Design a protein around this ligand. Structure first.
Ligand code: HEM
Ligand code: CA
Ligand code: CA
Length: 306
């Protein structure tokens, strides 16, 4: 069983070292907190939170970094290497990369103004990476609500609260124009924009992402508070201002009978959202972990120990 006190004797300073690393990085890269939370999400949705996403290519298995949901998108790997080295110096061969990334995600959320809590620990590192599984399990922005629900259920998160609360991760961070081009100019082959996108915001987004423009251009997920972790993401949805299709469907999908009340509840109360986010985060962090003597305590998060 995972426990928040796992390193209280072997490495009581691990959380502080992780925090310091992120604080320093945030000065030159204000997007790193968001990037790190996303790395944890993409780690957990593929064979569980086992740091499999951190592994680089080998001649026997491909890296998950080349998955459709990670390639030219996932970032912050060098920052993880940095905190891992700092932690390895303070506590040799003690903290797994899987746990390190989990702590990094929580600290990132807190540093951005979100809730503060101690995450369950005791996870161990995978002996391989899963590219095919990553391509199959990571949800895409063009997924319908039923598809989003299916994706979460597939990895073990059955609750609509899991989906709505965790989607709150889009309260900060960046998104490439490529992922909303259809919503802006030709949605579902209708030759028209997505009707669930506020028309005033549509104009703004079209200006940032013109047709035939730079598809890699970045746009803020939350137009209200782009870098602050808060409940503004849900207020946006209520106004049809969710950035990607998967965001807005939580409020506008024909299948949103169960998610709409959750969106409203989180928009109406920061406390309600924060409580739900921590609850959902710990549930995601509990997805099929390797524990005890299973797996290893990876020394270099990019490669399996030898
Ligand atoms: C519900 C399904 C979800 C879908 C389809 C989805 C999709 C996306 C997409 C398309 C991007 C943009 C990537 C890019 O343009 O490079 C992204 C970024 C991001 N996502 Fe999600 N996401 C989902 C759930 C989540 C969850 C559960 C979390 C975390 C709890 C999360 C956290 C983030 C963050 C923080 C960013 C910004 C990362 C950065 O700026 O580096 N996402 N997501
Ligand atoms: Ca994983
Ligand atoms: Ca925000």
């Amino acid at each position: 069983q995972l426990t928040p006190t796992f390193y209280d004797n072997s490495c009581p300073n691990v959380s502080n070292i992780v925090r310091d690393t992120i604080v320093n990085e945030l000065r030159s890269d204000p997007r790193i907190a968001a990037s790190i939370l996303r790395l944890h999400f993409h780690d957990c949705f593929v064979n569980g939170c086992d740091a499999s996403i951190l592994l680089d290519n080998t001649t026997s298995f491909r890296t998950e970094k080349d998955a459709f949901g990670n390639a030219n998108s996932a970032r912050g790997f060098p920052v993880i290497d940095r905190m891992k080295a700092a932690v390895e110096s303070a506590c040799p061969r003690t903290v797994s990369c899987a746990d390190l990334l989990t702590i990094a995600a929580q600290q990132s959320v807190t540093l951005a103004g979100g809730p503060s809590w101690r995450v369950p620990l005791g996870r161990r590192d995978s002996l391989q990476a899963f590219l095919d599984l990553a391509n199959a399990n990571l949800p895409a922005p063009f997924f319908t609500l039923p598809q989003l629900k299916d994706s979460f259920r597939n990895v073990g998160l059955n609750r609509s609260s899991d989906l709505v609360a965790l989607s709150g991760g889009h309260t900060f961070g960046k998104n490439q124009c490529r992922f909303i081009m259809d919503r802006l100019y030709n949605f579902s082959n209708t030759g028209l924009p997505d009707p669930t996108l506020n028309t005033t915001y549509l104009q703004t987004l079209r200006g940032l992402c013109p047709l035939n423009g730079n598809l890699s251009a970045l746009v803020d997920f939350d137009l209200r508070t782009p870098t602050i972790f808060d409940n503004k993401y849900y207020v946006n949805l209520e106004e049809q201002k969710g950035l990607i299709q998967s965001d807005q469907e939580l409020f506008s999908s024909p299948n949103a009978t169960d998610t709409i009340p959750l969106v409203r509840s989180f928009a109406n109360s920061t406390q309600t959202f924060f409580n739900a986010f921590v609850e959902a985060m710990d549930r995601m962090g509990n997805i099929t972990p390797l524990t005890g003597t299973q797996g290893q305590i990876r020394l270099n998060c990019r490669v399996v120990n030898s």
